[PDB]
Design a protein around this ligand. Structure first.
Ligand code: ATP
Ligand code: ATP
Ligand code: ADP
Lengths: 53, 59, 501, 178, 478, 479, 70
């Protein structure tokens, strides 16, 4: 009972840490994805040049 | 495993940003279609069709 | 990190693209109804080509007429306009394969439904790669381990042998499947638990148990949601088969768990029925035999010339009310390597696993199990069959012969050896221990209902006192006099320990 | 290999053995022109109205519009065998069956711009090279959704089809995300 | 707004509609038909597509009574799949197959609506915890524990107290735990639907006034309804439930009864769809439709949708496919053997097939696991002896087997749970039992504490101390 | 030309069209070729059964439906399919169309007999009746074969039939100096492989040097199409046919399973636009068995003795394919799930299994009395056993209480071990002589060895060994 | 789907309809296989009248549908 409850508490703490790390990574990814719209225009122009011969 | 899930989300977000950039590519392509003349780009289309017709006879 | 580096890779993917001269067969879709797409035009289409729609819900072209082509909807196409340009893909249902699958819940369109991220994969494994050749393959001469006692005891499974678990519902079929999966922890055995047509909560439970037991580091679970289209629900075992071919073809022997196959037959029946391909008997299409034939014959044992691996198969089929004379459990028993049952009576009556060897049978025999257990108790299967009959005969128990009294109490204690706790996968050497404890009549004098306690005491006693026994025999696979001596020695000792008390 | 297709095949075959090839071709053109109006089509399609009156009406239209006796005899067999309910798809496939037996390969090459007719003849020669067909009945129509490229469609009905208009973009947007 | 046009064919329930050749509607989306009637041309004819069938024609399924309409009615494509009101608008409202409130109350606010069906929830969006809650019915709490958030299967034929068992279960868990309690009636006896509705009104779990305080969404679909309506009410009720598990993010109680009538409606509509038949009579797609209605029930990461589904086993045939799909598709099979009700036990539940994957030592405690074991071994042995004791009489057994038969029938009559709602049917005001009972009645039976009181002395009494007091009373009356 | 198009392909049924110049006859081999998924020169062979008008024909393909696409060329050989036959065609395993599937050197393909041929009329049938002993106890006692006859293995759900064929082949292939042939017809491929390994082992294939192999294996897969499986029996039968007329030797056939062939015929007949029949099968079942069991006949020219496994589904007899297969058999061995459940092998209930060659005058009128006494007490026990199961043997009256234990010993005694089944049993088997059999049974049925324990008769080759095992059992009753 | 939907007989038909008569003398096959055959013509054929086959392998006719005798 002792080791099982201890490992369950540790697993809850690790789940909290995983939730926090995942929220951090997802927020940073969404921020950087909204960022850099100029490379999108540049790559769209490059795609125009690739398609149009 | 949860650490690997973060890199899974990272690759998925990379593909999502790539998809939004492909939407911007579709936008720029539609802009180029509007700025693709009904006679000049039509002549380019005819010449590309002739080259593709040579490719088709080769195919 | 996003939008800050990937633009150069965007340029890399754009520049250097094909601009191909690809003439394609292209079809104007005519008749979509209920998971099928009877499509007009589309002449030169190979039966089995994936056919790309407007949507992206691709589809296999199974049947084809002079006018129409019977095409299914792998992925239900909920909005497809009539007359849509539905061209084929040219290629034939190929499957990408890698060792990086080892753990990801994967869908039948090779797609990770794990949440772990997409897999790089090189080869394109066909969905109808045929059986390995007749001359090319060796007999199943090498053991593969169950972890469950009674199966390896009487009715052996072997690497390359395709034993068939069978039984009614709710009797531990999936349970003994997962047990004989996570038995494989050091045997270099890939397991492919192909889950077919059941609760996704159940497949989440089994991958939870696999995450507990660590076995999801090497196993590949092909899930099938019950909401998945029936084309996908019958396709998925072929995907699992080709994926296990990918590892057996290198050297790497593997195991597969179809779970189940009866839902595969039912889903395939639904597809053939909507395809109007006429039914055979019991309202099934006739060639569910052919379907499962092509499936299970893609599971065998390689020989040294091509890799000497194996693809031992465990297709569970579900039979209602304990029948055998249901049509799919009539086909698969002919096309399997013997069958094992889980009677509801034997499960709910404590025999867990519930393999009554009166109807259970493994049709390749001892050559696919270890020589130690061979030399100990090859005969014990038939002895227990006689004990089962005579115990049915000992219903008339008024004046039993003394010899048949010995025989009945003997096989009684033997059946009590074939009791084992939930998910306790015994060492195969421990199975040798208990099988010799039974076959040498030490337990005959002992207490008849404390044999489980005698066994756990004995196995702890040998695993502590003489662990040299199990390693020397696992290095020799042979029941020698050293094994005998260590066995009977610890038998005297622990028999004393449990007599007192 | 449907019923309409095989009746079309019988008609095209009797035209081919009797040399009434293009006569029956133009005849089925004016015939489906006549069947365009649903009053007379419904007059034949209704099984309630009396067969002798239907036959008289058919032979009447035959004599007035001055048709081939072969297609006349054919549609008399059709009203007799009751399959005159199907004449829409019967003739609509008969033109293509005639095109088949005369080898003329109808190839609808849509595009976004009305291509130079020399380039029509150019790709006509190319697809006759790739097909071996007698004629390639080149067919064009302006498609605005097609961006710029040539967009052929040949084969039996729409089977074989090559494009360069949106298919180029589809190539790029498909292969990029892989 | 979308393609208007004409229905070209009506064949009883099913209907075939032609359209403009340009744009045919979606598959699985809805569309109303105006049509006609006696007074007014109402939009009562809601419809739903099933099969685009050539010649710009869609073959579609009806939703209401479909006489009076004709070929060539002014069909209206609504384009979208069938929307349905969700939200607090549901709460308490007894609305119908398309969401309109047929409880003679106000037309609920359409500010929050949802389509009829959707994709299956995700492999990850399944939960992980093998959740267990008790009910109070002792045979269940002994040998068929209930995966909450999972699926709770109620089997049995007709006239075996299955709907009544559902009434008892909802009679407990209406004021017991769980948030919103969505009952759905798939093909219910509508007098019994309004009966348990009045039981909710009297019991007050539903609300007379301020009905948006209910945590109850009783969207029945009556048995009288056309086969499209019976085919869709299950999807309506599960749309409510998944709405709450995703928007209330709530543990939703999902009493539904009985989905055999739903798949029989599917069979009946397929027989006019011209889809070829299947095993013994049903639709060929029973597997996929049951898969839809199951896989779109899940315990989410936040909403444990506990579903209590009944299945009308037709003529007590377990090898029928309509069972044979479901009790692969669910967690807690509870078959209610009719012959036990012939004997007179209520509920009439066998132990042998009524089972669960919740019955695991690492879930219920090894103590409760072996409790259920030591019941089940004995009763299975009793059946194995039953089929040869009925022929050739009682005393041809051993002393042991005679005692084991006595103790097995002890457990059998001991599981005769008197039901709290069944007082008005039988007379006995039923009792509530729990886990102390679950251990102790078993313990006294299997140890042999209660070993001389007769078979009546634990008959129709839940509590084992109540059985002891009953034994005292019957021993006193002599 | 004769080049046609394939208009419809549905499963292994292929609707081939043709120009009106040529529409070939039935049964003719058609070969679409040169195409695969890899651009390979892969050919598929397909024969024709129904020709559905307009110069078009629906065919059945002997290889997989994958590869070939509608509107493709097809080259009919202008002839029915022909199987390469000869003494050069021994040894190697080969296809239904005859291609050597042993993947080493192909046999010399020069003498190809057509696969569909005439059946021998009874004016050519060798009416000479004869007796065969094969060393397996219950068979050569109670179902004695005709050395010349047709031999049936009515098996149940995978019980003892194929291992019985392996044992019997092992015992008689060396015995019969004439030609022999196994036909693997829809056989499980790994057990056909195990059989092939045993032929390599026992040297009947003579793996180091072939065409002295008097055995010849031809196999058709389960995983092969039913178009293959519905003619692989005809392939093997034609090889035996060539050896029975041209070679006209003593020829031995061991096809397995004939019901595989039946199911394949049913399988394609559902597809190729034909009605169903009574449960299971095609409406052409009786004529299929007619073609087979009229072509496998020991001729006045040359003898033949064909054994064949008959798997009945659901393990019954009212099933229509065994309802005609019994009518086309002469040496019937019917196995039992019950006797397999009690381990007794071969699990033949001797009640059902009989033979035409069990006439008293032709088996010896004392051997016949042995057979009658065993069948009598055995059948009476199989009657009594349910009354036992409800009222106790010890109650069940003495004049039958002796006979129940007697026949109970009898059946287990006629369970005798096999030289290959030792992997399943533990002790290497025994080749038993019929004199030893009738001797031991003349002990048991008389009631001389009623002193022995019953399990002393368990799995024992000879009755003197049964006395030996009896002394061992008594010795261990002391110890 | 129709009987005699074979377009060879229909070719002959549309060539030579132009009368109101039968074809009663002899006939041709339309369909054949598995020992049965659907044949055209010889319209007067008695119920169970024997049929002189091509290649002499004669048979009896019991199906005698409109355009096709079996
Ligand atoms: N050795 C054992 N001891 C105790 N219980 C067991 C044992 N083996 C299996 N079981 C039990 O069998 C029950 C049913 O498991 P499982 O789902 O595999 O049965 P099933 O017949 O496959 O049901 P389904 O076919 O619906 O999946 C499980 O709850 C499991 O505890
Ligand atoms: N548990 C019970 N308590 C009291 N009476 C019962 C019980 N079960 C059945 N009965 C009697 O049997 C009749 C019908 O049985 P029951 O109500 O169980 O079938 P049901 O619930 O309608 O089944 P289903 O709901 O599956 O159709 C009831 O009207 C009642 O009189
Ligand atoms: N009493 C028995 N004696 C011999 N083999 C047995 C017995 N019981 C079961 N078997 C098994 O049955 C198998 C043979 O079954 P059989 O019907 O001959 O082949 P299949 O199962 O392929 O049809 C053997 O491989 C063996 O393992």
């Amino acid at each position: 009972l002792e080791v099982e409850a201890k490992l369950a508490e540790g697993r809850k703490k690790i789940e909290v840490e995983l939730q926090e790390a995942l929220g951090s990574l997802e927020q940073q990814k969404e921020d950087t994805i909204k960022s850099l719209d100029s490379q999108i225009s540049a790559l769209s122009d490059d795609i125009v040049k690739k398609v149009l011969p | 495993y949860k650490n690997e899930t973060i890199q899974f989300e990272q690759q998925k977000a990379i593909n999502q940003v790539r998809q939004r950039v492909f939407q911007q590519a579709l936008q720029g392509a539609l802009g180029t279609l509007n700025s693709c003349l009904n006679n000049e780009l039509h002549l380019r289309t005819i010449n590309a069709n002739i080259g593709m017709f040579g490719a088709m006879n080769e195919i | 990190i996003r939008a800050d580096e990937i633009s150069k890779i965007i340029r890399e993917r754009i520049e250097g693209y094909n601009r191909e001269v690809k003439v394609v067969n292209t079809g104007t879709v005519l008749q979509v109804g209920d998971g099928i797409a009877r499509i007009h035009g589309l002449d030169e289409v190979m039966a089995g080509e994936l056919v790309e729609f407007e949507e992206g819900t691709i589809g296999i072209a199974l049947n084809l007429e002079s006018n129409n082509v019977g095409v299914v909807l792998m992925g239900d196409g909920l909005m497809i306009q009539e007359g849509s340009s539905v061209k084929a893909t040219g290629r034939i249902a190929q499957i990408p394969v890698s060792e990086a699958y080892l753990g990801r819940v994967i869908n039948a369109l090779a797609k990770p439904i794990d949440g772990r991220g997409e897999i790089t994969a090189s080869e394109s494994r066909l969905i109808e790669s045929p059986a390995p050749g007749i001359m090319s393959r060796r007999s199943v001469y090498e053991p593969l381990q169950t972890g469950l006692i009674a199966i390896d005891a009487m009715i052996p499974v072997g690497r390359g042998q395709r034993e068939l678990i069978i039984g009614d519902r709710q009797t531990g079929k999936t349970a003994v499947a997962t047990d004989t999966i996570l038995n494989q922890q050091g045997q270099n055995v890939i397991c492919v638990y192909v889950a077919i047509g059941q609760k996704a909560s159940s497949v989440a439970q089994v991958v939870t148990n696999f995450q507990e037991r660590g076995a999801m580091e090497y196993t590949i679970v092909v899930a099938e949601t019950a909401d998945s289209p029936a084309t996908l629900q019958y396709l998925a075992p072929y995907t699992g088969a080709a994926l296990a071919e990918y590892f057996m073809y290198r050297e790497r022997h593997t195991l597969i768990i179809y779970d189940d196959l009866s839902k595969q037959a039912q889903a395939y029946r639904q597809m053939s029925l909507l395809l109007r391909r006429p039914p055979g008997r019991e309202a099934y299409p006739g060639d569910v035999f052919y379907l499962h034939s092509r499936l299970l014959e893609r599971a065998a044992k390689l020989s040294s010339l091509l890799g000497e691996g194996s693809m031992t198969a465990l297709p569970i089929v579900e039979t209602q009310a304990g029948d055998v004379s249901a049509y799919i459990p009539t086909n698969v028993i002919s096309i399997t390597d013997g069958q094992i049952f889980l009677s509801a009576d034997l499960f709910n009556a404590g025999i867990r696993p519930a393999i009554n060897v009166g109807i259970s049978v493994s049709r390749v025999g001892s050559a696919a199990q270890i020589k130690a257990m061979k030399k100990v108790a090859g005969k014990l299967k038939l002895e227990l069959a006689q004990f089962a009959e005579l115990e049915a005969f000992a219903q008339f128990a008024s004046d039993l012969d003394k010899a048949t009294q010995n025989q009945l109490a003997r096989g009684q204690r033997l059946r009590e050896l074939l009791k084992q706790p939930q998910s306790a996968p015994l060492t195969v050497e421990e199975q040798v221990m208990t099988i010799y404890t039974g076959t040498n009549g030490y337990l005959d004098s002992l207490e008849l209902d404390q044999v489980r306690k005698y066994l756990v005491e004995l196995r702890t006693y040998v695993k502590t006192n003489k662990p040299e026994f199990q390693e020397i025999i696992s290095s020799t696979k042979t029941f020698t006099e050293e094994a005998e001596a260590l066995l009977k020695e610890a038998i005297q000792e622990q028999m004393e320990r449990f007599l007192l008390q | 290999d449907s019923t309409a297709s095989r009746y079309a095949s019988a008609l095209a075959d009797v035209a081919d053995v009797t040399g009434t090839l293009e006569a029956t071709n133009s005849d089925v053109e004016k015939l489906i022109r006549i069947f365009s109006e649903e009053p007379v089509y419904y007059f034949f399609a209704n099984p309630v109205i009396s067969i002798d009156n239907k036959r008289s009406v058919l032979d009447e239209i035959i004599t007035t519009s001055g048709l081939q006796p072969h297609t006349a005899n054919f549609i008399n067999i059709l009203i007799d065998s009751e399959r005159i309910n199907l004449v829409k798809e019967i003739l609509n496939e008969f033109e293509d069956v005639f095109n088949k037996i005369t080898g003329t390969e109808v190839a609808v090459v849509t595009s976004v711009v009305k291509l130079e007719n020399d380039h029509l003849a150019q790709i006509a020669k190319g697809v006759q090279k790739i097909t071996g067909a007698k004629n390639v009945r080149i067919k064009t129509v302006i498609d605005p959704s097609l961006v710029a490229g040539f967009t052929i469609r040949y084969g039996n009905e729409g089977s074989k089809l090559v494009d360069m208009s949106v298919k180029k973009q589809l190539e790029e947007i498909a292969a990029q995300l892989e | 707004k979308k393609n208007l046009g004409r229905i070209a064919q009506i064949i009883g329930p099913v209907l075939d509609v032609a359209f403009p050749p340009g744009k045919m509607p979606n598959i699985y989306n809805a569309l109303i038909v105006k049509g006609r009637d006696t007074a007014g041309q109402p939009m009562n004819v809601t419809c739903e597509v099933q099969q685009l069938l050539g010649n710009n024609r869609v073959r579609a399924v009806a939703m209401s009574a479909t006489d009076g309409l004709t070929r060539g009615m002014e069909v209206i494509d609504t384009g979208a799949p069938l929307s349905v009101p969700v939200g607090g608008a549901t709460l308490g409202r007894i609305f119908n197959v398309l969401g309109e409130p047929v409880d003679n109350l106000g037309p609920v606010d359409t500010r929050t609506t949802s389509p009829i069906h959707r994709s299956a929830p995700a492999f990850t969006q399944l939960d992980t915890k093998l959740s267990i809650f008790e009910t109070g019915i002792k045979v269940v709490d002994l040998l068929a524990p209930y995966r909450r958030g999972g699926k709770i299967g109620l089997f049995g034929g007709a006239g075996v107290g299955k709907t009544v068992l559902i009434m008892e279960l909802i009679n407990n868990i209406a004021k017991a735990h769980g948030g919103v309690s969505v009952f759905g009636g798939v093909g219910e006896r509508t007098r019994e639907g309004n009966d348990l509705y009045m039981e909710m009104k009297e019991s007050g779990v539903i609300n007379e006034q301020n009905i948006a305080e209910s945590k109850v969404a009783l969207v029945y679909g009556q048995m009288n309804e056309p086969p499209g309506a019976r085919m869709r009410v299950g999807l309506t009720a599960l749309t409510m439930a998944e709405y709450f598990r995703d928007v209330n993010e709530q543990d939703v109680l999902l009493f539904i009864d009985n989905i055999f009538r739903f798949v029989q409606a599917g069979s009946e509509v397929s027989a006019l769809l011209g889809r070829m038949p299947s095993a013994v009579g049903y639709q060929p797609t029973l597997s996929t439709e049951m898969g839809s209605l199951q896989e779109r029930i899940t315990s989410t990461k936040e909403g444990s949708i506990t579903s209590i589904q009944a299945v009308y086993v037709p003529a007590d045939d377990l090898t029928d496919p309509a069972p044979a799909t479901t009790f692969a598709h669910l967690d807690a099979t509870t078959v209610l053997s009719r012959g036990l009700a012939a004997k007179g036990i209520y509920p009439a539940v066998d132990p042998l097939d009524s089972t669960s994957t919740m019955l695991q030592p690492r879930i219920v405690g090894e103590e409760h696991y072996e409790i259920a074991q030591r019941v089940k071994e004995t009763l299975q042995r009793y059946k194995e002896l039953q089929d040869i004791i009925a022929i050739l009489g009682l005393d041809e057994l051993s002393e042991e087997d005679r005692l084991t038969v006595a103790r097995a029938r002890k457990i059998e009559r001991f599981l005769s749970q008197p039901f709290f709602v069944a007082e008005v049917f039988t007379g006995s005001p039923g009792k509530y039992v729990g886990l102390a009972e679950t251990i102790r009645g078993f313990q006294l039976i299997l140890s042999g504490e209660l070993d001389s009181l007769p078979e009546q002395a634990f008959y129709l009494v839940g509590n084992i101390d109540e059985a002891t007091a009953k034994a005292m009373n019957l021993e006193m009356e002599s």
